[PDB]
Amino acid sequence: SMTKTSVDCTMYICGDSTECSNLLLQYGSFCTQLKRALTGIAVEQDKNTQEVFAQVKQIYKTPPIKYFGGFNFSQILPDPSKPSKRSFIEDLLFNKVTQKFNGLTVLPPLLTDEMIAQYTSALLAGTITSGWTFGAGAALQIPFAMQMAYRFNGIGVTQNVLYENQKLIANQFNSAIGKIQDSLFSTASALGKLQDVVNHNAQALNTLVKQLSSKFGAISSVLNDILSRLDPPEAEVQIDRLITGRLQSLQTYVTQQLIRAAEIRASANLAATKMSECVLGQSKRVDFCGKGYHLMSFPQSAPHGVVFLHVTYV
Amino acid sequence: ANQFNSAIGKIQDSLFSTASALGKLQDVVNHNAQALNTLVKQLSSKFGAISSVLNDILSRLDPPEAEVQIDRLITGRLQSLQTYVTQQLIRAAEIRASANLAATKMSECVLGQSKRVDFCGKGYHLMSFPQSAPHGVVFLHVTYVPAQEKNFTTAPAICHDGKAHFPREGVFVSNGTHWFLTQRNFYEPQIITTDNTFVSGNCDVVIGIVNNTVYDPLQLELDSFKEELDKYFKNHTS
Amino acid sequence: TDNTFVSGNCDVVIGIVNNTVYDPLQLELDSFKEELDKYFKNHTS
Amino acid sequence: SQSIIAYTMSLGAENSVAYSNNSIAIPTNFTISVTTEILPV
Numbered sequence A: 001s002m003t004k005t006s007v008d009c010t011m012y013i014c015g016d017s018t019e020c021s022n023l024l025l026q027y028g029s030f031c032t033q034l035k036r037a038l039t040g041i042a043v044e045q046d047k048n049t050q051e052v053f054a055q056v057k058q059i060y061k062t063p064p065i066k067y068f069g070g071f072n073f074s075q076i077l078p079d080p081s082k083p084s085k086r087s088f089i090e091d092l093l094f095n096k097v098t099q100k101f102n103g104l105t106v107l108p109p110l111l112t113d114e115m116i117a118q119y120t121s122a123l124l125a126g127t128i129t130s131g132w133t134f135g136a137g138a139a140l141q142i143p144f145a146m147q148m149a150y151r152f153n154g155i156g157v158t159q160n161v162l163y164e165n166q167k168l169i170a171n172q173f174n175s176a177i178g179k180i181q182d183s184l185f186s187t188a189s190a191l192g193k194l195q196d197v198v199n200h201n202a203q204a205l206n207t208l209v210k211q212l213s214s215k216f217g218a219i220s221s222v223l224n225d226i227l228s229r230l231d232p233p234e235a236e237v238q239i240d241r242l243i244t245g246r247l248q249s250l251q252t253y254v255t256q257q258l259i260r261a262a263e264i265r266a267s268a269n270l271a272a273t274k275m276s277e278c279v280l281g282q283s284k285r286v287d288f289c290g291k292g293y294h295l296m297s298f299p300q301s302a303p304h305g306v307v308f309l310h311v312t313y314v
Numbered sequence B: 001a002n003q004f005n006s007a008i009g010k011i012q013d014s015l016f017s018t019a020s021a022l023g024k025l026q027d028v029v030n031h032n033a034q035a036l037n038t039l040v041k042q043l044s045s046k047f048g049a050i051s052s053v054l055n056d057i058l059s060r061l062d063p064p065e066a067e068v069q070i071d072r073l074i075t076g077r078l079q080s081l082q083t084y085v086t087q088q089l090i091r092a093a094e095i096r097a098s099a100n101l102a103a104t105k106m107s108e109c110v111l112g113q114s115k116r117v118d119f120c121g122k123g124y125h126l127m128s129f130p131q132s133a134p135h136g137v138v139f140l141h142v143t144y145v146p147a148q149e150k151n152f153t154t155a156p157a158i159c160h161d162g163k164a165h166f167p168r169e170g171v172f173v174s175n176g177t178h179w180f181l182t183q184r185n186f187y188e189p190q191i192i193t194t195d196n197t198f199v200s201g202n203c204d205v206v207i208g209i210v211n212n213t214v215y216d217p218l219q220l221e222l223d224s225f226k227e228e229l230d231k232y233f234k235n236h237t238s
Numbered sequence C: 001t002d003n004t005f006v007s008g009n010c011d012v013v014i015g016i017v018n019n020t021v022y023d024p025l026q027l028e029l030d031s032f033k034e035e036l037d038k039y040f041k042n043h044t045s
Numbered sequence D: 001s002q003s004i005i006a007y008t009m010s011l012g013a014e015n016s017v018a019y020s021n022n023s024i025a026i027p028t029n030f031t032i033s034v035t036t037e038i039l040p041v
């Protein structure tokens, strides 16, 4: 999801100028379309954020003692000793990922970060305490060793390979999840998409609100100066010129926002598919849920996105 | 069959009374109608000219003076048309993405059985049936959902004669006194035999391996015939 | 009996048909038992 | 006296999976469900 923004036509274009506001009335519904487009974008952002994470009927919870057959999940299970129940990796992602005064308000997301963290924790608890059974109706508990035997049998490896190599596999998984916190922020590569989304939104807002200093051919970029220094009939031309310039700026901003909203909705549909398949089950699709034979995945909430920890067998 | 009939009977009540779904096609129609209405209402604007009707401006002005008003109205209407076409193009891209998804769903759920989780319904997908709706398609995903769960005590393997016996298919369960082998999505307990188990190594490596008796039908029949043969031999000797 | 698994009785399925299901072990055991019985009968008389 | 009430969202009934150590849950029945999915074409 991207940042939800709302725009006021009159305040941005002809703020606190009755005559300028009246002159805008000659363009008809030239900006009710803008308002409707931005409202649709915001509602779609809420729909994306709900569709990606809200895939569990109930909020599952891990048992008080965290022992899952030797697999160390302490780096993705919730940490109670925090104001928001976010795991270690979730907290690191939140920390790493870091204009209103002219009719540009930013709406807050419908789901708080605490609620997204709760959804992620519920999905993780279900996927480690109930296998894939929680994505197909009622959640049926199963020991984690038998669930890893499930997943090994699902990729053409007999379960005795896991049962005779439970210790080595557990150590390998613990080490592999140990290296995530170093292969996430220091090697660049990934994690640039959420930062790019944030930067694109902030930059678009700044560019749209920087157009107020342009002249577009008028005498001055300040409405009050033109109003005071000129008689009404002659100042009408310059006010119309500024109105045209600011309307073009607003329409350009709205168009780029719509295009970016379509791209982000495509990404969010892909993320929802990835959650439903990689997380809520075992995927036989190649390269869809990691490089190798997919075993089972984990979601981690991130600012304006989701992070998957794809466990694979190689 | 009774469950399927009841489920299909309720499809005409949970589709038009609970709202939820069936709002996407109506939303598409509403978006198209609203865009067209906004485009047609832009013909009443002046955009700074003296009138929104070209006939009036043509009648009341000389050509060289009327050029300016005509050009102003042309600019306004051209901007409106450009906006409408851009919004239509973006909506067309979104609708084409949805239509590609619909074709994929048809091919992979109606024309076959899908192992993709939650792609063709919440549960284990059995089949889907398509229905035609105005400017869209409707699927009826038949799914298999386990309902009544009873939890047993499990074990990864069974060490019978110093060898670990893993399940060929399913999991080992016990109701408290005896151990069975049942399938994985339904409680169908079966006696643990060598036909549904395979041996890999001893029972010193598997964690949680549970002692039980692995029944061998071949050895049972061999002992049954051997006892009779021995009895006959003993009777013949004395 | 290798490629067919038994489940319940025949009064539950709709469309179940009669047919003989060949048993390899049973056939071999019957053959060897008949041979042994013939040998014992020859030995007795 | 019906009125407008504002409340915090509910993410679902709080359920704790009875994840034991050597216990598994196996269904003894099932339910055929016919869901719906509407996609603009």
Ligand SMILES: *[C@@H]1O[C@H](CO[C@@H]2O[C@@H](C)[C@@H](O)[C@@H](O)[C@@H]2O)[C@@H](O[C@@H]2O[C@H](CO)[C@@H](O)[C@H](O)[C@H]2NC(C)=O)[C@H](O)[C@H]1NC(C)=O
Pocket (backbone or CB within 6 Å): B159, B209, B211
């Ligand atoms: C599982 O059983 C083995 C085998 O024990 C044999 O079979 C049993 C059913 C019972 O009849 C035993 O008396 C038989 O000997 C156990 O191995 C035994 O372990 C004990 C305890 O250390 C030892 O004194 C015996 O000598 C072992 N017997 C053999 C044949 O090696 C095994 O310990 C049992 N497992 C568990 C978890 O209790």
Ligand SMILES: *[C@@H]1O[C@H](CO[C@@H]2O[C@@H](C)[C@@H](O)[C@@H](O)[C@@H]2O)[C@@H](O[C@@H]2O[C@H](CO)[C@@H](O)[C@H](O)[C@H]2NC(C)=O)[C@H](O)[C@H]1NC(C)=O
Pocket (backbone or CB within 6 Å): C016, C017, C018
């Ligand atoms: C399938 O067979 C059953 C059982 O028939 C018996 O076993 C057969 C192998 C053969 O030896 C038969 O002669 C045996 O009777 C059939 O059920 C029988 O139906 C008849 C006719 O109504 C009835 O008189 C018998 O009592 C039934 N036998 C039993 C054990 O209930 C059944 O009809 C056969 N299926 C079909 C489609 O013909």
Ligand SMILES: *[C@@H]1O[C@H](CO)[C@@H](O[C@@H]2O[C@H](CO)[C@@H](O)[C@H](O)[C@H]2NC(C)=O)[C@H](O)[C@H]1NC(C)=O
Pocket (backbone or CB within 6 Å): A072, A073, A074, A075, A174
């Ligand atoms: C699971 O991972 C956690 C996190 O790394 C481990 O906790 C660490 O334990 C070491 C050894 O005592 C300490 O030096 C670290 O400070 C701990 N880290 C944290 C974040 O608390 C934990 O030991 C692991 N559990 C198992 C069973 O391997």
Ligand SMILES: *[C@@H]1O[C@H](CO)[C@@H](O[C@@H]2O[C@H](CO)[C@@H](O)[C@H](O)[C@H]2NC(C)=O)[C@H](O)[C@H]1NC(C)=O
Pocket (backbone or CB within 6 Å): A065, A067, B207, B208, D021
């Ligand atoms: C879960 O089962 C395993 C054995 O199958 C237990 O693992 C060890 O159990 C002893 C007590 O028998 C504990 O003192 C050890 O700490 C356990 N090992 C580890 C690595 O934690 C485990 O205790 C069993 N029970 C629970 C409640 O987890």
Ligand SMILES: *[C@@H]1O[C@H](CO)[C@@H](O[C@@H]2O[C@H](CO)[C@@H](O)[C@H](O)[C@H]2NC(C)=O)[C@H](O)[C@H]1NC(C)=O
Pocket (backbone or CB within 6 Å): B002, B003, B148, D028, D029, D030
């Ligand atoms: C599985 O569930 C079905 C459906 O809920 C049960 O069938 C019901 O059985 C009761 C008791 O005989 C009848 O009153 C109902 O009319 C049946 N429902 C239907 C739709 O036919 C069935 O008994 C359950 N099976 C098991 C083994 O528990």
Ligand SMILES: *[C@@H]1O[C@H](CO)[C@@H](O)[C@H](O)[C@H]1NC(C)=O
Pocket (backbone or CB within 6 Å): B149, B150, B151, D018
């Ligand atoms: C699973 O067993 C536990 C412990 O006895 C019990 O609380 C729970 O109800 C059982 N599950 C079901 C579905 O009955």
Ligand SMILES: *[C@@H]1O[C@H](CO)[C@@H](O)[C@H](O)[C@H]1NC(C)=O
Pocket (backbone or CB within 6 Å): B175, B176, B177, B178
């Ligand atoms: C467990 O199941 C077996 C086989 O049906 C039965 O004989 C036994 O009594 C059952 N035990 C309990 C405690 O219900």
